[PDB]
Amino acid sequence: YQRFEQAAAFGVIASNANCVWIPAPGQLITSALEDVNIWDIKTGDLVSKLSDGLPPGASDARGAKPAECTYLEAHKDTDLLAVGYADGVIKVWDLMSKTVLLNFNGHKAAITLLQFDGTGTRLISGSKDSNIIVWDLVGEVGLYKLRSHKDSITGFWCQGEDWLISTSKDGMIKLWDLKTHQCIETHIAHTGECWGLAVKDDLLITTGTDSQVKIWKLDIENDKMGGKLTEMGIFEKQSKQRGLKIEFITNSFFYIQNADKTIETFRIRXXXXXXXXXXXXXXXXXXXXXXXXXXXXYSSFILHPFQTIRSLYKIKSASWTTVSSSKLELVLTTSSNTIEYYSIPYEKRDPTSPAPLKTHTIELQGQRTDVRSIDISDDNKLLATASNGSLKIWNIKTHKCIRTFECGYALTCKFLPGGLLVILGTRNGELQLFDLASSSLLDTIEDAHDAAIWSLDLTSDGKRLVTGSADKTVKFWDFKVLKLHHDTTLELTDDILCVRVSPDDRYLAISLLDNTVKVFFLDSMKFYLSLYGHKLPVLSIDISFDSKMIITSSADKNIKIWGLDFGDCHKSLFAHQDSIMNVKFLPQSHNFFSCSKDAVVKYWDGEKFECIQKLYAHQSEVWALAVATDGGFVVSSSHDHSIRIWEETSLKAGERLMEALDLGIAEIEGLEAYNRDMKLXXXXXXXXXXXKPQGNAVLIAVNKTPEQYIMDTLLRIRMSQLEDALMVMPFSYVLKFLKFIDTVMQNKTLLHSHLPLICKNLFFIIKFNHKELVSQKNEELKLQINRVKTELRSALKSTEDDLGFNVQGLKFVKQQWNLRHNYEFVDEYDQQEKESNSARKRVFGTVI
Amino acid sequence: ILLMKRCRDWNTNAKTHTIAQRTIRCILMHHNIAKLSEIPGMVKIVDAIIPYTQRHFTRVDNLVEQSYILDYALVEMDKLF
Amino acid sequence: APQEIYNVGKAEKDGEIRLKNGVAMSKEELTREDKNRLRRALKRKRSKA
Amino acid sequence: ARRQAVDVSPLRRVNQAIALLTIGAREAAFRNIKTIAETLAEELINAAKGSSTSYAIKKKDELERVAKSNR
RNA sequence: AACGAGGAAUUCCUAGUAAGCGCAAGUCAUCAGCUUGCGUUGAUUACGUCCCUGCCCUUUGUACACAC
């Protein structure tokens, strides 16, 4: 067998996380899948990647998709990059040592926000569920967990060490206390959720769902109801859409990023900047107090609208700097694996330019959209073909690209070995041939088809070509020297989705729009055979290198291996729980790699049809697959722009109360003799006392008082076990238990909580142990029972006076209503019949 | 009145009856009482409470009877010694 | 019998959860861990009946 | 598996006494010139004196001293 | 030559029982290298406990009161 492991992943420039910025012409750290990407803004190419030695398919990764780096945050003092992953695990990365050192996990969901301060060296994490967990990097223990939200965490701010402010994915905002571990105030923000939170020390800004921000002011007011956090202003006009992340920097500008390609920048002002504006508003109020209340209902006092920034791809992450307080520079990561650098000049008054400057762009190494098809040359030269038109030429030994072109709505690509030319298939009915040494648009045949083409293949010579389309046609093409021409077009019954030419150059299989695979003789077009029984249109057709067996699979998640000689089958194998997309063959052995929509690439054998290897490189869809013609490395093209290349290699009741009785009363007799010490110390002479005998560490860890710690063991003993575990206690502990009740009687609050339980327990011990308790002479026992009988009777009479008052008091309330509201009846036998009908009736099961 | 609806719920069991009996006594001693004489309309609901209290009155008075076993224990020990 | 002139039942309004032991929950104050516990308590009780 | 001394029921004291005195007769006249009638008279008379030469008295103080070694 | 009441390790057994003793029959299966009945003699030691090893049940009291 073999063990193939992935070498690297490419086109992973910007994943779904917030980036961070490094000073120096700055540097930028973005997110990758199971990695993070770090480069220069100036050059753009990678300088390092942060991962351990874990490839999927090896002993490290198991049967699950890898954790996407869904958040990262870096501090420039310790050079620690705290990354949040998709399964709630928390990793921290040394930048110079490129190694993870601590690996916590406390969340069951993906980590949304991370904010960590090196001033106390603490790490605060926020996930997609409610829990905010604060770790410390010096003790590696989850110190205090903040759990009061209901939906999620999306806002985040830590203010030293007494408060914490967070917003959830339902429109409500919390403030907690450090010391008291609980919340203080909650306040709803919007009807929908409040995504973004940016904080300056005076104002808190929170966006909503319908292009609405709320400007809130914090205070250190100790009032119970209000004044902790107020809601004076609402500003509008971001877009029609709403923001997700808001961030602010000083010399006094802040920005909000939407989901509709729109970053909006607004300027906040200060005291005299708004106080002169207040006089300007007072000049507006003069031109009763209608305008003054309209100046209190307002947002031009703080929010000065600077400008908006319109991108073309969906804006994902943004962090921004400023240089010399005149040029604010904004870094952007798009939906695609592309980086935008936006620089805006200002003189603290004017936007100074209509559009932001694109001084730095990273586009030449990503994928820019979803990649659709792959090409592998004979000497390991890769090509990638995407949807919007990025045909990129990659080399494995560099792990980089050479150049990229523009090629329309391209779908498929086949590589001609002769001259190293690339045949390209667009969704438009046209063909393209692109060269390496010369230019690209030499001879691109327009109007070759009407509808969308879906499959291309070629002969082993390369001079003959086939184009399968949804025009219910397949067209044969030949190259005459320097242009392609059509040779033979066959109409068919349905749309054609997958075409493969045989490596023996004798067969040409066609996947129709039905569940039919019809294979023709390549020499003659003579309708050799048809296959049927897939229940869905077939997406991938393969035949072996020696041309004995056909391997096909459709969207109904099964591989139905056929026989090329007779049209029989060998194995119908269900796998790949979403839908099977593509099948590729090893060029020397009967082995087929299946890539599918559920992010799994499986390697099977053609002689046992069991899973020999299972690959879990990523989590999104796998669009195409490719296998090298001589070596055997497998290239997988993903939906999230990933190119993975796989190079091959005890106690009992009664006893529990006894230890409770022995521990507490030795502590009780400990404090009793100590109380007699200070009565003999600080009264007569001086006398250096015992200086507080220490309580037990078992007592002080839970911090239960010794009367209480004995007491709840009585509740923990069950009701039928108590009568038999109370006679296992001998008379020496009986004298202790009488001393225990005489000490818990001094706290009347503790007695009345479980007074009938104490009454049942005490008057069973003394009832059973009566002969020893009476015929043992002790003045202390005479005093202790005298204290406990007079106090238990007084406590029982106190709770019996309340019961008997409520019985007699509310019987009066009943009988007063029964003469006031009740209209009584004179007719005695008719009244007693009516009361029997008006009385309560209940049904019970009986036996006659 | 809504507290008295919740007070009837707490009186149903035999552990929370001390809180339930204190709250009804709070209505008739600690509150504004002549105002509470004025207001009708709840008196059907308050009548469903009372035979639970008479069970709890008879149980507690039986516990007073079991508390005089100590009075026998103190007298007989004093007589013997 | 006094338990037959009132046997305590389930809550008259969906925002509360009454129980047989006389105590009563309310939905909008309960923690999600305890609400999941009371979900599991009512699930195995209804599976018994 | 430590030995722990426990006290003994009066019925068990009778049952162990009769079992040890009979075996003391049977083991003494195992292969000897004396028969069972002679040695049971020798075992019972020595047991009544507590003269520590019968098998039954020799097990009485041995089982106690084993129990006396760890109370 | 083996053999002086039988090693480790295992199995069974609570009263007309274990154990010992003879007599009779040979029942459409099974049994003569034995099987099945019928009598005589007739004990020790638990008859409690869930501590260990197992095996099962229960964890809304719903079967009507009281108690809990």
Would the CB atoms of B9 and C18 count as touching at under 8 Å?
Answer: yes
Å between B80 CA and nearest CA of chain C: 47
Would the CB atoms of C32 and A150 count as touching at under 8 Å?
Answer: yes
- Rounded distance, CA A480 to CA A484, Å? 6
How many other C-beta atoms lie within 10 A of the C-beta of residue A236? 9
Instruction: Tell me which protein residue sits closest to nucleotide E63, measuring alpha carbon to C1'.
Output: A845
DSSP state of A695: P
- Rounded distance, CA A546 to CA A505, Å? 11
Residue A645's nearest CA partner among A56, A13, A1 is A56
Statement: the CB of B59 is under 7 Å from strand E:
yes
Identity of the residue numbered D43: E
- Rounded distance, CA A348 to CA A324, Å? 12
Residue A399's nearest CA partner among A81, A150, A28, A45 is A45
> Which residue of chain C comes nearest to B54, CA vs CA?
C2
| 3-class state of residue A277 by DSSP | helix
Phi-psi category of A121—alpha, beta or left, where left has phi over 0 and alpha has psi -120 to 50? left
- Rounded distance, CA A346 to CA A304, Å? 13
Q: Is A774 on the interface with B (CB under 8 A)?
A: yes
**Cited resolution, angstroms:** 4.0
How many other C-beta atoms lie within 10 A of the C-beta of residue A827? 9
| Kind plus residue range of the DSSP H or E element containing A124 | strand A122-127
Q: In what order do the strands lie in the sheet with A569-574?
A: A538-543, A549-554, A558-563, A569-574
DSSP state of A33: B
Would the CB atoms of A821 and B54 count as touching at under 8 Å?
Answer: no
Write A217-226 long-range contacts (CB < 8 A, 24+).
A218/A165
Residue A793's nearest CA partner among B55, B61, B78, B53 is B61
At residue A489's C-alpha, the angle toward residues A483 and A491, to 5°, is 155
Would the CB atoms of A789 and B54 count as touching at under 8 Å?
Answer: no
Q: Which residues of A346-472 form beta strands (DSSP E)? A: 357-362, 371-376, 381-386, 390-395, 400-406, 410-416, 421-426, 431-434, 453-458, 464-469
How many CA atoms, within 13 angstroms, populate the side-chain half-sphere of residue A712?
6
- Do chains B and A meet with 3 or more Cβ pairs nearer than 8 Å? yes
Tokens 């900047």 belong to residue: A273
Å between A658 CA and nearest CA of chain C: 31
- Rounded distance, CA A45 to CA A143, Å? 40
Q: Is A771 on the interface with C (CB under 8 A)?
A: no
Identify from C3, C5, C6 which residue to disrupt to test chain B contact, counting B C-beta atoms within 10 A and taking the largest count: C6
Print the SS3 string covering B30-62: HCCHHHHHHCCCCHHHHHCCHHHHHHHHHHHHH
Would the CB atoms of B11 and C22 count as touching at under 8 Å?
Answer: yes
CA distance to B24, B35, C16, per residue, from B3 (Å): 10, 16, 15
Å between B76 CA and nearest CA of chain A: 7
Tokens 């109801």 belong to residue: A225
- Give φ, ψ of A400 to 5 degrees: -130, -170
Write A166-171 long-range contacts (CB < 8 A, 24+).
A166/A113, A166/A126, A166/A132, A166/A197, A167/A193, A167/A194, A167/A195, A167/A197, A167/A206, A168/A130, A168/A193, A168/A194, A169/A193, A169/A195, A171/A208, A171/A209
User: How many angstroms is C1' of E59 away from CA of B69?
Assistant: 37
Statement: the CB of C7 is under 7 Å from strand E:
yes
Spell D14-24 as b/e; 16+ CB within 10 A means b: eeeeeebbeeb
User: How many angstroms is C1' of E60 away from CA of C19?
Assistant: 10
Instruction: Tell me which protein residue sits closest to nucleotide E44, measuring alpha carbon to C1'.
Output: D19
Print the SS3 string covering A652-666: CCCHHHHHHHHHHHH
- Rounded distance, CA A367 to CA A454, Å? 21
- Rounded distance, CA A820 to CA A815, Å? 9
